[PDB]
Design an enzyme around this catalytic site. Structure first.
Site, PDB file in Angstrom:
ATOM      1  N   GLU A  35      57.651  48.991  52.057  1.00  0.00           N
ATOM      2  CA  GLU A  35      56.296  48.902  51.538  1.00  0.00           C
ATOM      3  C   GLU A  35      55.700  50.219  51.065  1.00  0.00           C
ATOM      4  O   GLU A  35      55.159  50.302  49.980  1.00  0.00           O
ATOM      5  CB  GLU A  35      55.365  48.296  52.609  1.00  0.00           C
ATOM      6  CG  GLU A  35      55.567  46.797  52.814  1.00  0.00           C
ATOM      7  CD  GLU A  35      55.159  45.916  51.639  1.00  0.00           C
ATOM      8  OE1 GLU A  35      54.484  46.396  50.725  1.00  0.00           O
ATOM      9  OE2 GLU A  35      55.514  44.736  51.665  1.00  0.00           O
ATOM     10  N   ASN A  46      47.172  46.159  42.196  1.00  0.00           N
ATOM     11  CA  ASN A  46      47.731  44.885  41.727  1.00  0.00           C
ATOM     12  C   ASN A  46      47.171  44.376  40.379  1.00  0.00           C
ATOM     13  O   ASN A  46      46.107  44.800  39.929  1.00  0.00           O
ATOM     14  CB  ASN A  46      47.482  43.833  42.792  1.00  0.00           C
ATOM     15  CG  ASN A  46      48.051  44.248  44.133  1.00  0.00           C
ATOM     16  OD1 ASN A  46      47.430  44.169  45.176  1.00  0.00           O
ATOM     17  ND2 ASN A  46      49.258  44.713  44.261  1.00  0.00           N
ATOM     18  N   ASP A  48      45.645  41.511  39.633  1.00  0.00           N
ATOM     19  CA  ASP A  48      44.326  40.919  39.863  1.00  0.00           C
ATOM     20  C   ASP A  48      43.239  41.941  40.179  1.00  0.00           C
ATOM     21  O   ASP A  48      42.135  41.571  40.584  1.00  0.00           O
ATOM     22  CB  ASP A  48      44.352  39.906  41.023  1.00  0.00           C
ATOM     23  CG  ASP A  48      44.665  40.444  42.422  1.00  0.00           C
ATOM     24  OD1 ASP A  48      44.806  41.651  42.598  1.00  0.00           O
ATOM     25  OD2 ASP A  48      44.804  39.650  43.345  1.00  0.00           O
ATOM     26  N   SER A  50      42.973  43.894  42.741  1.00  0.00           N
ATOM     27  CA  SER A  50      42.982  44.343  44.125  1.00  0.00           C
ATOM     28  C   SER A  50      43.978  45.490  44.351  1.00  0.00           C
ATOM     29  O   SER A  50      44.747  45.876  43.462  1.00  0.00           O
ATOM     30  CB  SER A  50      43.318  43.214  45.065  1.00  0.00           C
ATOM     31  OG  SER A  50      44.655  42.746  44.979  1.00  0.00           O
ATOM     32  N   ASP A  52      46.635  47.613  47.316  1.00  0.00           N
ATOM     33  CA  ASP A  52      47.241  47.671  48.624  1.00  0.00           C
ATOM     34  C   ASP A  52      47.208  49.070  49.230  1.00  0.00           C
ATOM     35  O   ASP A  52      47.443  50.056  48.538  1.00  0.00           O
ATOM     36  CB  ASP A  52      48.661  47.237  48.541  1.00  0.00           C
ATOM     37  CG  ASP A  52      48.870  45.858  47.958  1.00  0.00           C
ATOM     38  OD1 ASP A  52      48.078  44.945  48.150  1.00  0.00           O
ATOM     39  OD2 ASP A  52      49.884  45.701  47.294  1.00  0.00           O
ATOM     40  N   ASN A  59      46.336  44.406  51.668  1.00  0.00           N
ATOM     41  CA  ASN A  59      45.564  44.069  50.477  1.00  0.00           C
ATOM     42  C   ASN A  59      44.023  43.967  50.600  1.00  0.00           C
ATOM     43  O   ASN A  59      43.456  43.357  51.507  1.00  0.00           O
ATOM     44  CB  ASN A  59      46.172  42.758  49.944  1.00  0.00           C
ATOM     45  CG  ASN A  59      45.729  42.513  48.529  1.00  0.00           C
ATOM     46  OD1 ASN A  59      44.959  41.613  48.276  1.00  0.00           O
ATOM     47  ND2 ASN A  59      45.966  43.305  47.530  1.00  0.00           N
TER      48      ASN A  59
END
Length: 129
Positions: A35, A46, A48, A50, A52, A59
């Site tokens: 990750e 991301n 959309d 958003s 991380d 998220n």
């Protein structure tokens, strides 16, 4: 902060993540490796809108507040910046909420694609834990 492999395994262990909700330590170290590459400051935007955050790339659409994800839920009750700290406590407590949702560790797409069904024991091999 960038963690060493056994250093992060020991910190995750001390915070109660070994076998939490049935996932052995090592599932969690493997997930953090792919990750964030064990970097607590890792961030990724991301499509959309958003973002991380942190060692476990949590998220902002559902779990933390970053002030810029229109429609977000903040279910862990914390600014997303707290997830970038060299103290992993916040990321560990929020991850525990996430795995407790009916999906388990499939919430982390890198655990699903590159840790799931592999020998995850290898990630904690020579560590004194």
């Amino acid at each position: 902060k960038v963690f060493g492999r056994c250093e992060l395994a020991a910190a995750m262990k001390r915070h109660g993540l070994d076998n939490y909700r049935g996932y052995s330590l090592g599932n969690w170290v493997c997930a953090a490796k792919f990750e964030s590459n064990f970097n607590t400051q890792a961030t990724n935007r991301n499509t959309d809108g958003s973002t991380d955050y942190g060692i476990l790339q949590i998220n902002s659409r559902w779990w933390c507040n970053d002030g810029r994800t229109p429609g977000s839920r903040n279910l862990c009750n914390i600014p997303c910046s707290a997830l970038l700290s060299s103290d992993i406590t916040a990321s560990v407590n929020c991850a525990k909420k996430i795995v407790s949702d009916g999906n388990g560790m499939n919430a982390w797409v890198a655990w699903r694609n590159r840790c799931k069904g592999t020998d995850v024991q290898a990630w904690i091999r020579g560590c004194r834990l």
